[PDB]
């Protein structure tokens, strides 16, 4: 809350471990393979825009 320099104040951060947790929707491989095949096509490309 104070615009004070933390470097001189002496605050330090020590990172011990870094992992990422991927979440998978369990969907039957029947339809999952179909979806990935249809999204591996060139017309079904995913478009994203910066807000």
């Amino acid at each position: 809350t104070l615009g004070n320099d933390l470097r001189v104040d002496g605050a330090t951060v020590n990172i011990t471990s870094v992992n990422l947790y991927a979440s998978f929707f369990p969907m039957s491989h029947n339809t999952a393979s179909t979806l990935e095949a249809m999204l591996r096509n060139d017309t079904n490309d995913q478009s994203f825009n910066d807000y």
């Binding site: 039957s28 491989h29 029947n30 339809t31 393979s33 179909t34």
Partner: protein, 110 residues
């Protein structure tokens, strides 16, 4: 001889002609379908569905049995059932609920 050839379901195609019962019986296989997750999914099961179809001026029934059932046995059983239905289309069926027993004691004697 052979009156209706309509195939109400497009997904199922005929495999044998409308053989007559001395009704008529037609065996229809199923066309290709979507992918399955695994091969052990089509014949897996034992429940049989007897679907009813609207009367066409004749009645049509869609009976589906699991794969492992013998086609000859299924055809013979369906033919016997059709013969029984044709012959019978009673009081015996009425006895097995809406006739009662104790109420069937005033009318017989009074």
């Amino acid at each position: 001889v052979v009156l209706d050839e309509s195939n109400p379901t497009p997904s199922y195609k005929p495999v044998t002609e409308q053989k007559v019962i001395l009704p008529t019986i037609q065996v229809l296989a199923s066309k290709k379908r979507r992918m399955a997750e695994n091969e052990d999914d089509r014949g897996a099961g034992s429940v049989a569905e007897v679907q009813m179809r609207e009367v066409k001026p004749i009645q049509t029934v869609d009976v589906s049995v699991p794969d492992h059932s013998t086609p000859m046995e299924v055809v013979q059983s369906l033919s016997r059932a059709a013969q029984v239905a044709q012959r019978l289309t009673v009081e015996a069926m009425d006895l097995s609920a809406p006739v009662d027993a104790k109420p069937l004691d005033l009318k017989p004697v009074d």
